[PDB]
Write an enzyme that holds these catalytic residues in place. Sequence first.
Site: not given
Ligand code: MTE
Ligand code: PM6
Ligand code: MOS
Lengths: 51, 745, 151, 164, 164, 305
Positions: B232, B310, B691
């Site tokens: 990120e 959070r 998550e």
């Molecule tokens: N296979 C896989 N699943 C995953 C991830 C990943 O890197 N690989 N990232 C996770 C995280 S940290 C998040 S925030 C969400 C983000 O994508 P979405 O917003 O489309 O769920 O995927 C989740 N599931």
């Molecule tokens: S709440 C929250 N969750 C995940 N990523 C972020 N970046 C900035 N705010 C966030």
């Molecule tokens: O909000 Mo997923 O990048 S930890």
Amino acid sequence: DTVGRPLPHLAAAMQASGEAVYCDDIPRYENELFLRLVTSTRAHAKIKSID
Amino acid sequence: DTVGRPLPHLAAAMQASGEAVYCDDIPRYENELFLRLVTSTRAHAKIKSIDVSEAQKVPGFVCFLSADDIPGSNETGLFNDETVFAKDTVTCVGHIIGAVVADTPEHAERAAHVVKVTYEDLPAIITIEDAIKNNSFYGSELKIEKGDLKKGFSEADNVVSGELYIGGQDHFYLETHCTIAIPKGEEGEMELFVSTQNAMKTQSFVAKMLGVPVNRILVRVKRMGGGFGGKETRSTLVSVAVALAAYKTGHPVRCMLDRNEDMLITGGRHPFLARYKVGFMKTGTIVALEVDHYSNAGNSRDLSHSIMERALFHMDNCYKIPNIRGTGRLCKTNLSSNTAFRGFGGPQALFIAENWMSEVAVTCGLPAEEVRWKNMYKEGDLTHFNQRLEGFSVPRCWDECLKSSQYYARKSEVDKFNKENCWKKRGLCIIPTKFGISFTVPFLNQAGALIHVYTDGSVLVSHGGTEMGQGLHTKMVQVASKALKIPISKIYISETSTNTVPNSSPTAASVSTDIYGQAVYEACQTILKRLEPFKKKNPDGSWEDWVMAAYQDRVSLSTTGFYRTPNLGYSFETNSGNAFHYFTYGVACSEVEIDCLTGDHKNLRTDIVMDVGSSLNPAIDIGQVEGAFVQGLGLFTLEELHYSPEGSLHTRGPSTYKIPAFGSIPTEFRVSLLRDCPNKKAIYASKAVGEPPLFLGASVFFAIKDAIRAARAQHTNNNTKELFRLDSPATPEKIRNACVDKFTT
Amino acid sequence: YTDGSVLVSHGGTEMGQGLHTKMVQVASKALKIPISKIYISETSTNTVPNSSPTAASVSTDIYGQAVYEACQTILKRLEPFKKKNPDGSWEDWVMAAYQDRVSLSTTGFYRTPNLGYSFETNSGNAFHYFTYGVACSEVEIDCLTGDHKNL
Amino acid sequence: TADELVFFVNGKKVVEKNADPETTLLAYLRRKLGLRGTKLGCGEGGCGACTVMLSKYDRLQDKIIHFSANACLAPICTLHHVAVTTVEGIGSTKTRLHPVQERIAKSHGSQCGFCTPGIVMSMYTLLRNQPEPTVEEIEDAFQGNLCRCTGYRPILQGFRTFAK
Amino acid sequence: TADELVFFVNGKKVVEKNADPETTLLAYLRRKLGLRGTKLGCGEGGCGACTVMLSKYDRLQDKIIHFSANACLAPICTLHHVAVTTVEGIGSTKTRLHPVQERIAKSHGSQCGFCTPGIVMSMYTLLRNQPEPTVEEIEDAFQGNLCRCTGYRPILQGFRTFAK
Amino acid sequence: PKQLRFEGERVTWIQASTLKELLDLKAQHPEAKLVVGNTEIGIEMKFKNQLFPMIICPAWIPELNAVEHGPEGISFGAACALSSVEKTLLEAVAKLPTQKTEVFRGVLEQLRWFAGKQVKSVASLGGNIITASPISDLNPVFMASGTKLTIVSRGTRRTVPMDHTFFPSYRKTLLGPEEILLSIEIPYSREDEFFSAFKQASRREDDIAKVTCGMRVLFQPGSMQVKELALCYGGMADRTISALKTTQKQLSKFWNEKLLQDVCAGLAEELSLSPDAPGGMIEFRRTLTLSFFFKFYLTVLKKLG
Ligand SMILES: Nc1nc2c(c(=O)[nH]1)N[C@H]1C(S)=C(S)[C@@H](COP(=O)(O)O)O[C@H]1N2
Ligand SMILES: Sc1ncnc2[nH]cnc12
Ligand code: MOS
Ligand SMILES: Cc1cc2nc3c(=O)[nH]c(=O)nc-3n(C[C@H](O)[C@H](O)[C@H](O)COP(=O)(O)OP(=O)(O)OC[C@H]3O[C@@H](n4cnc5c(N)ncnc54)[C@H](O)[C@@H]3O)c2cc1C
Ligand code: MOS
Ligand code: FES
Ligand code: FES
Ligand code: FES
Ligand code: FES
């Protein structure tokens, strides 16, 4: 506001220095190949063989 | 129309044949060079000299790069408290000092290892304890507070207090960080291929470092072999370094990290210390709570403030608590900057909550399920931050989980097993969770799309989100197909790029399907409207006919689409306004067996009921539940980072850092999605899944604790109502030592 | 973009005629910002689909118009910010629109009006307007060789 | 004054005239021969992202043997007259997928996809030694393969289809 | 059994160990050295798109001489101890433009831009031979350079600023 | 089938086709490095940073690949892969009576959750032994059973049982500079002879502090009176060690509650670690050494009365 003013072409300086990129100026990939067309030598004919 | 059907991930076939392209799989240019970072070996020091004479003898050597070579700005990071390259002073073990450029990555590795740095040490802060006593924090205290704390405590029958620690976690995405940078030679133009979740900031940070407008820089992202939050922001460390090498040499340049480099440099999840005090009745009813959280943030701010926010928003879990004060602090230390990791502070706060809860049950001598249930919110309650809970479905999830896991029957078996066994014990626990959906930063809740229909009737979709395995593109293609009413085989998504959708938020917070789904949906409607007149003129023709008559009549077949989440905006004064759009819920039950004589354990069975409203794809969603949960089971039991006294990381590969394996998972593994529960608030009535499930792995942690208690009742003392401290992660060392007996003593 | 720099893209190609130069001059007057803030990079089928070939001398007319419409849309979305901070800069207005989740991307389109000549009936407009000019030249020829000078 | 190294990759002959003893197989397949199916996950033998199948005729035993191996640790210099099979050797979306590839895809056993080539080559090695394996043999063929996305259930469920 | 070819390109030494007698300079600059300023227009000596400056010490005359030449026809094999100057050798937007480059750009003498490097090298050669030329010498330095965009007037008007 | 030479930027590699060719080479170049599977040498060149300008590869040599079934036990060539050893041992165990396979079942245990198939297909037996990691899971078993090692050079040839003297200091073995390990004989167990092996689950530092062990007891004919006792441990020091002082004291004693007490007192005392011992986990490790014995103590009883 430049509309109506004799502004030089925006790429002119880099055309003059040889830095402007045309198509064959793009770098080649390490595996990049090359092609050449094979072309007719007759006005009008049947192709009877290619060797 | 495939929405609701188990459609496999669109790239899966090409992933199984090795044909899908990741960043380092892209062919090299003939003149393409390689970069390797040079990194600090000290926690905290003055740099007194840098010697490159040995590195110069290596064949293929091109040049060393350092802070002096930068034309733009050596100031970077999310709050501008970071250097691209350190100047006079290093501030943690993996801190970036410079880089080496060579003609092969082998040559780069060999030259980097041989660069000599001279240091003069400065006193260092490593632990949370060290940071508190030296008062070393970023910004000032954060707080949420409701009701009356005096009074709460003054009417409590009982009080319990203590201290809890939770270790961090490395992301271990199978593909490490990776950038290619291609310089054009015109006007500062540069094109970059990168493994990141945040093409936007990658573009900003490169242009700032270069001293060049943002409109010169193109960032393109096809897919990531994993992200989990570690891509990120922290991917810009490699990205900017590589850009500068391309600027300076005039050649294409790349770098992929080795694992050992990735774990040292790029940051992990925040460790948390908690100090707590709960007041309750004899019935187990909670009546007052007070928690001070400290996180270990490392040598920059990054996302640490948001992560603390959070966490505070989650200190309640699923429990109604009328008098409550939670505070939070961010520890400024000499370690690599910590950052986002799946859950984002939520699992830490949630883990702290379930720990005092389990101690209330034991202190009262009541069963745990009963104490957890008495204390749950009910439909329509407000949270400690005054948000209303609507469509609160934990009671359902709880109920079906108890029934289909056969919880009470299997509880008898466990006691039986414990009465008949001496040096082995069993445990069984059941745990709820809620998780708030939205960026806590109101302005990130925006999303754009760009759709073209070509004259053959085929459709190219492009949105601000990236693929990292979660199946986002698969889902958007399902969405578009339903919205336009044409088969999925007519629609394609190719990549994510800053020149098709600008100014996009990182792919994060689990909201991507919600927000890009909505933006893609708006672009479809606009296309349908413009096509309407041609459909009326030829009611019995086909998609291809209508598209080609619209084109010949000079009606445009391109449009943007946009979405902005409504009614978001929580205030830390006033304590009001919505922080989340809605909540995602679930429940997990787990059973383990421990070996009291070795510290080893087996995961016998786990049952999960998860509420995802009406799923866009049950198969993707069940996949997201299992993945998240197993990563949580890693956080709470297997995975451990360990440093030297001088602040240097020891755990740097799969042989010292153990992430769950094929045989780590529970022998009986069962997941259901809850039925008949549409979400009014998101695309096609679905819910965010990424998550929310991760915290449920804690159910394995509390099943292990339950089993330590019975081992303790066997061999140590007669105080059933005894509390002992168990930190996370519960490794075999922690489990064995807690099983005090005739050998530990 | 959030730094206030602008990326313009249109269906036309550069071949030496100065099309991009002119589009940049257009955008700059339409938005009222200096030209150094605007950039065009290339022409690509993934940014502007289904384009006519750059030809018939109309590219400036038709892409100018389309660029012009995109700029108007941008100015309308930025209008409330300009009212809140009437003495700020371009950069300030851009950043406050961003932080308030107003989109800074848009298409633009133009269709030439009232065209369509018919070979039957012999009517309807074939052209939008006419371009005109006059030239005078003098030469000297060598009657013995066939050679000539342009004087 | 230096011998030629001669081996086989996906049934095709490779004659290396200037082998360097430090060169890994992984590096040779990706960077010399341009086959990027096989992946770098750790470089220290623990993740399996780099798994390939090795085949040789055993001058002692008398048989052809097939066994799996980590390309990141195999020096090309140990491979004179060895045959290598990579993921691109057993099937392709351009021609036809091998059943191992088909089954993992269609069972949702691949998410981000980075560990899939390696898991596919571990299952395929097991099948070439034992065409009808037990459930038990199946689980075991994967001790050196890590996956961070799936939690493993869907991969075992999909491959268990090959047993009894 | 084969001699090394040694020459200079933009003040830098090139040591060619395996020169092929068929290799043109144009091909060597573009494809071996990565300097693409110099362009292919016809391959037969009529267009000047490929014009460079050559410099050598004349063992007879006693002097250094500077003359222009067509890179498309010059064999690298005629070039042992010769100095080549290309458009990238005289000036750059990254450092500073040579006055020849400046004046053509600002006078609107460059439209599509493909012939500009070659016109630039013809003017520059003339100036190094004669720092203060006449109008007549100027017009004449261009008989081997074709431009299809500009109709020539603005290039002469711009360069006529160097005369008297 | 002849000897091949490869020349690199830094390294020369000789593939030896013949026992002779190898011993000649190790004589001419005593500092040279033997490489079979590369699962240790490769790690030292990438991470721990070594450079070895001269490498010799003995894999092709028969002898070093040979698998022989004598009257005393089973002999394995030093280059035999761990999966060959595993495969051969599973087979002997499914075919010979229980009382003869106690050491074999120990080796198979240490080999259970020991890396994946990929590693076990190229890791050589001789490689694990000569590397001499303080945490090697195989050396403690080999030591406690006096598994016999055949060591050879141009001229010399000798066969020693492995005991505590075979590992003199951190990562060194008692071989001369010109010597190679040729083959390894894992013994059958006799009548009244019992064996167990154990290892600590996870692991945290590179080559220190992971408790791993081999345990052996020999009784007087048909009785419960100790004649020989061996308890060898990894992850307690900077090499594989035996608890000589403790076991020596139990000779002649009977297998009972009081024997249990004295070995634990003896272990706590002989193997103790200073609070600042490298690898940490000070109490856990101590607890394991006692706990592993407690298991052995019970397993023996179940196998007698
Ligand atoms: N296979 C896989 N699943 C995953 C991830 C990943 O890197 N690989 N990232 C996770 C995280 S940290 C998040 S925030 C969400 C983000 O994508 P979405 O917003 O489309 O769920 O995927 C989740 N599931
Ligand atoms: S709440 C929250 N969750 C995940 N990523 C972020 N970046 C900035 N705010 C966030
Ligand atoms: O909000 Mo997923 O990048 S930890
Ligand atoms: C991921 C992984 C997991 C592992 N897990 C374990 C484990 O759980 N328990 C454990 O104990 N080990 C473990 N190891 C260590 C591994 O088993 C050893 O790497 C292996 O047995 C050494 O074999 P090799 O042939 O590959 O050695 P090489 O790397 O080729 O060489 C090893 C050393 O032995 C010497 N040598 C080899 N043959 C002879 C010869 N016959 N005579 C004299 N010297 C010789 C060499 O000179 C060299 O110094 C693991 C390794 C990896 C890669
Ligand atoms: O209409 Mo111009 O392209 S011939
Ligand atoms: S790359 Fe991880 S095992 Fe080879
Ligand atoms: S699918 Fe991502 S690592 Fe297995
Ligand atoms: S290319 Fe036209 S003259 Fe050399
Ligand atoms: S500018 Fe186009 S050829 Fe001269």
